[PDB]
């Protein structure tokens, strides 16, 4: 129940996020520096939308804007929906999921740097933020749960700040 963009970003350890800014193009990778993902915004003139690019600039996820949808690789065609977000804090629900049982939900605040991903019929943390060109703050992955799932929401809390 943690295979939600792809299997392959599910590690078998927990992984620490981060994110670096050097208009929302900034990168995430882990605490060490290693880059996980490109954050980028595909057309100039265009902040709805976002894609999620792994270091060979390939692209993992595109969201596109109170609602956002999320979408495989660098698409935004229904065929390629993965889930749909609603702004306790944030509900989940993944593509096949027509209806009102979230998947996962985010509660806690990002200014207190407190976000905590939960899964939705069982209320296991998958995911746990910590305060700390670094912004403040670290967002542990646990093990097997999808770190580029993960990685999107905090793309998306990342929107609603800003």
Same mark, same amino acid.
């Given at each position: 129940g943690g295979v939600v963009v792809?299997?392959?970003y599910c590690a078998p350890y927990p992984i620490?996020?981060?994110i670096v800014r050097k208009d929302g193009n900034f990168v995430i990778t882990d605490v060490n520096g290693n880059l996980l993902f490109k954050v980028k915004e595909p057309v100039f003139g265009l902040h709805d939308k976002r894609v999620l690019l792994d270091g060979s600039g390939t692209p993992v996820?595109?969201?596109?804007?109170?609602?956002w949808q999320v979408f495989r690789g660098g698409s935004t065609d229904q065929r390629d929906?993965?889930?749909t977000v609603k702004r306790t804090k944030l509900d989940v629900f993944? %593509?096949?999921?027509?209806?009102?049982r979230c998947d996962f939900?985010? !509660? /806690?605040?990002?200014?207190?740097?407190?976000? #905590?991903?939960?899964? %939705?019929?069982?209320?296991?943390?998958?995911?746990?933020?910590?305060? !700390? /060109?670094?912004?403040?703050?670290?967002?542990? #992955?646990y093990p097997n749960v999808d770190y580029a799932f993960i990685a999107s929401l905090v793309v998306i809390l990342d929107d609603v700040n800003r």
């Amino acid at each position: 129940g943690g295979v939600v963009v792809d299997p392959k970003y599910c590690a078998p350890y927990p992984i620490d996020m981060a994110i670096v800014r050097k208009d929302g193009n900034f990168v995430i990778t882990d605490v060490n520096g290693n880059l996980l993902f490109k954050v980028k915004e595909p057309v100039f003139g265009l902040h709805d939308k976002r894609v999620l690019l792994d270091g060979s600039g390939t692209p993992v996820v595109t969201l596109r804007e109170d609602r956002w949808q999320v979408f495989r690789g660098g698409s935004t065609d229904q065929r390629d929906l993965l889930y749909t977000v609603k702004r306790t804090k944030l509900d989940v629900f993944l %593509g096949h999921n027509k209806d009102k049982r979230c998947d996962f939900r985010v !509660k /806690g605040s990002w200014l207190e740097r407190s976000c #905590v991903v939960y899964a %939705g019929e069982s209320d296991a943390i998958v995911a746990q933020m910590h305060r !700390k /060109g670094k912004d403040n703050f670290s967002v542990t #992955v646990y093990p097997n749960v999808d770190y580029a799932f993960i990685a999107s929401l905090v793309v998306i809390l990342d929107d609603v700040n800003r």
